[PDB]
Design a protein around this nucleic acid. Sequence first.
RNA 1: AUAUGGAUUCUUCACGGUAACGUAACUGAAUGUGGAGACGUCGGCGCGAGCCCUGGGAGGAGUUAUCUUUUCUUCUUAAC
Length: 135
Amino acid sequence: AKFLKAGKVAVVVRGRYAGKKVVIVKPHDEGSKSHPFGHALVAGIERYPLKVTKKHGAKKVAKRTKIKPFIKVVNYNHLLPTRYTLDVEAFKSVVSTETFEQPSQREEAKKVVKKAFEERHQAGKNQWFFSKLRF
RNA sequence: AUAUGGAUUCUUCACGGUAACGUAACUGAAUGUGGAGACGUCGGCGCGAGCCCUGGGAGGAGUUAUCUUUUCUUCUUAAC
């Protein structure tokens, strides 16, 4: 009866990313010395790709499909779990507790996440995840 | 009207905080939505400003047969 697993998709509810979909990578149920609460390490989308029609040229399609990712430690109370799933094995090793608290390692993980999201978006799958929420 | 500095970009249009949110900055046309402009009267209570009262001290003046370390007066600080 536990659903906050390592591939669950949730919606951020607070903190500059509210209304943006996210996928849980590493959960921490019994808190930690820092962040003494139930929290998860998540990677999400900050700038969703724009809709592409058949009239768009080669240059414009590549521009409109760019995705800007982010990584964040989020309290459980600030997430809204969904029923969707997204495999994270391609980038689970690069995001962890170590990659935070260091500016250089945060950017290295983000570009790896960006490449994974771009390839996932191409050859369309997980269409709900890449669709911007309307509110 | 315009230039320089700063900021931003090879992940093109910034990062931090669990969060409330923070910052020297940190593209946004049509169209749409929201806020400010924009609001009665009476009652007590809290707080601020000016005034009033008052202690010590540094100056000036008055009274002094007798008494009064005394009576009066100056000691101020704007927008931004």
